[PDB]
Amino acid sequence: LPEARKLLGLAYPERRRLAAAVGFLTMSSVISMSAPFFLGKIIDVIYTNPTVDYSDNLTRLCLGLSAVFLCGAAANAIRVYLMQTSGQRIVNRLRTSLFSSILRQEVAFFDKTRTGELINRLSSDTALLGRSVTENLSDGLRAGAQASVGISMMFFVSPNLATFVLSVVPPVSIIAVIYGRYLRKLTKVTQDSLAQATQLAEERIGNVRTVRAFGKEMTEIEKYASKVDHVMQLARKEAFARAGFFGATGLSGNLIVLSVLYKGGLLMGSAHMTVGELSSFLMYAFWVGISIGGLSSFYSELMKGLGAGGRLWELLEREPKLPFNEGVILNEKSFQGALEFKNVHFAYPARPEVPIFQDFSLSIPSGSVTALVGPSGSGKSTVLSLLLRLYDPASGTISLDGHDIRQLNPVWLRSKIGTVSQEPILFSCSIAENIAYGADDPSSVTAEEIQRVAEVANAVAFIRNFPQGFNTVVGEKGVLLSGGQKQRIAIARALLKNPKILLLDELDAENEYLVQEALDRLMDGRTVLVIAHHLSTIKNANMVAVLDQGKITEYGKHEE
């Protein structure tokens, strides 16, 4: 019921179509359940006491039923369409709403949650939930209605035969359900054993380096063989129980029909059934049988849809631990570009036991180039993650012109901070689209504006030399670029963004000249914090900071 209110509100914008489709479902079902009654009359017209006017009755009964079938098909076709489209619209709203919720979450969420799981929840689970309040809902509704009308029509056609069926079917159904539960137990045992053999395989294949190192390849093969030989043993037992069940179920189905023909055939003489009447009863009995299986499948899909529901309401109602677009914007006169780290303590969410910063204090002055030095893996790149507020420190404060960056709007704070990595991330778009990404509105930037920043970044030359120019598709699924080329597109993107604060992370001879010339134009008049591996940039940097054991161990000029 509380989860049903969520599913009712989800189907609510399509209430108009779902009500129309249900109206068309009613018509299609009414025409469909009338068919065995009229088919029974056709059979009796030909085979009860055929008169000379039997062909005249048959012709109007068949032409009449043809028109009803054409009407029923049109009503069913309209139902399927309206039900499918309603689901499509619900899924569409779920997809846009889920993706919006996902992108609003903090980086820490993505650090723990797999991309594939988010994509599967956005593609599979969204489609399943939409289907459950539409396609599945109408399927179970139709099935529930046809069973009801069917049982009612069996008692109408022959109360005696219907009473007999209803005295045989429940005991047999109870026995079959008990057998069905025992069969499910043997299936779980086999599937749990299969999982165990697969877990062993996954562990040894995953750690094949250790298996090889000890020469245990043949030892693991024999170990795995024993686990899958056990699966086979359990599967044979499950196969025997399934064969005995299917045989008993099959025989029951055949003998029950044989009983109805016998019992019905011997009914004398006012409770007697004509061959057409017996055809009505059998058709209605077969419709109840189908409808029972329909309700069974409906429950199976309703449970799958509820399982998908829980996975989606989990992300749709999720609140990010770090603000998305909440905070204050500092004035043009209030913002100078001076940044300060004060006793910062931080460990990544994936590895909280491994500290990255242990009492990290650093003062980056406005308009001055600060060089960050240290060994590989010391945690220099983590400084840029905390400055852009991708994570909040466990202890300590990061301030901009005396104002805590936690009080400010992170979207605005990031618009004033730019970054040029050693290996920049470029999307599978055109060179122009990737450059336009810097602007607050990449749809507002003109072709002349993209060309201007490309000339300053010394990128215009190689870009024009490409067959499609600025429309040359880069990224992973695009044209392979050199480190220097990728960096100059990253400089062009940063130049168009025009940040006050710039963060640099540091190659042949030809590339490194045009890149450093463009980096010079980019660095000028900006607060620069560069993580260096080259002694050339440390030498001309305003101040140098050494990071050792998560703390600024040394501070001052290159010579000092």
Ligand X SMILES: Nc1ncnc2c1ncn2[C@@H]1O[C@H](COP(=O)(O)OP(=O)(O)NP(=O)(O)O)[C@@H](O)[C@H]1O
In the region spanning residues 374 to 393, those forming contacts with ligand X, defined by CB under 6 A, are 376-382
Give the whole-angstrom CA distance, residue 465 versus residue 482: 14
Say if CB 326 and CB 409 are below 8 A apart: yes
Candidate segments 116-124, 310-318, 338-346, 459-467, binder of a second copy by CB under 8 A: 116-124
What single DSSP character describes residue 105? S
Sort residue 475 into left (φ over 0), alpha (ψ -120 to 50) or beta.
left
Using CB under 6 A, which residues numbered 27 to 66 contact ligand X? none
Residue 108 touches which member of a second copy, ligand Y01, ligand X, none, C-beta under 5-8 Å by kind = none
Using CB under 6 A, which residues numbered 321 to 380 contact ligand X? 348, 350-351, 356, 376-380
Neighbours of 429 (CB within 10 A): 18
Residue 214 touches which member of a second copy, ligand X, ligand Y01, none, C-beta under 5-8 Å by kind = a second copy
Using CB under 6 A, which residues numbered 62 to 121 contact ligand Y01? 73-74, 77-78, 81-82, 85
Residue type for position 309: G
Confirm or deny that 180 is annotated as ligand binding: no
Nearer to ligand X, 11 or 384 (CB): 384
Candidate segments 80-88, 165-173, 352-360, 534-542, binder of a second copy by CB under 8 A: 80-88
Give the whole-angstrom CA distance, residue 546 versus residue 126: 50
Confirm or deny that 249 is annotated as ligand binding: yes
172 binds ligand Y01 (CB under 6 A): no
Confirm or deny that 150 is annotated as ligand binding: no
176 binds ligand LMT (CB under 6 A): no
Instruction: Compute the least distance from the CB of residue 25 to ligand LMT, in Å.
Output: 31
Residue 380 touches which member of ligand X, a second copy, ligand LMT, none, C-beta under 5-8 Å by kind = ligand X
Kind and range of the H or E run holding 440: none
Rg of the chain on CA atoms, in Å? 37
Coil, strand or helix at 503: strand
Neighbours of 54 (CB within 10 A): 15
Say if CB 485 and CB 547 are below 8 A apart: no
Partners of 505 in the β-ladder: 531
Confirm or deny that 505 is annotated as ligand binding: yes
The answer to whether the Cα torsion of 43, 44, 49, 53 is positive or negative is negative
Residue 76 touches which member of a second copy, ligand X, ligand LMT, none, C-beta under 5-8 Å by kind = a second copy
Say if CB 360 and CB 396 are below 8 A apart: yes
263 binds ligand LMT (CB under 6 A): yes
Nearer to ligand X, 376 or 444 (CB): 376
Say if CB 484 and CB 515 are below 8 A apart: yes
Nearer to a second copy, 113 or 361 (CB): 113
If we measure between CA atoms, which residue out of 539, 559, 517, 549 comes closest to residue 371? 539
If we measure between CA atoms, which residue out of 81, 39, 548 comes closest to residue 284? 39
268 binds ligand LMT (CB under 6 A): yes
Residue 378 touches which member of ligand LMT, ligand X, ligand Y01, none, C-beta under 5-8 Å by kind = ligand X
Using CB under 6 A, which residues numbered 240 to 279 contact ligand Y01? 240, 243-244, 247-248, 251
Residue 259 touches which member of ligand Y01, ligand LMT, ligand X, none, C-beta under 5-8 Å by kind = ligand LMT
Residue type for position 15: R
Q: Concatenated DSSP letters for 163-211?
A: HHHHHHHHHHHHHHHHHHHHHHHHHHHHHHHHHHHHHHHHHHHHTHHHH
Nearer to a second copy, 155 or 245 (CB): 245
232 binds ligand Y01 (CB under 6 A): no
Give the whole-angstrom CA distance, residue 531 versus residue 529: 7
Residue ranges of the annotated binding site for ATP are 377, 379-382
Contact residues for ligand LMT, defined by CB under 6 A: 259, 263, 266-268
Q: Enumerate binding residues for ligand Y01 (CB under 6 A).
A: 73-74, 77-78, 81-82, 85, 240, 243-244, 247-248, 251
Binding-site residue ranges: 249, 377, 379-382, 505
Provide the binding-site residues for ligand X, judged by CB under 6 A. Answer: 111, 348, 350-351, 356, 376-382
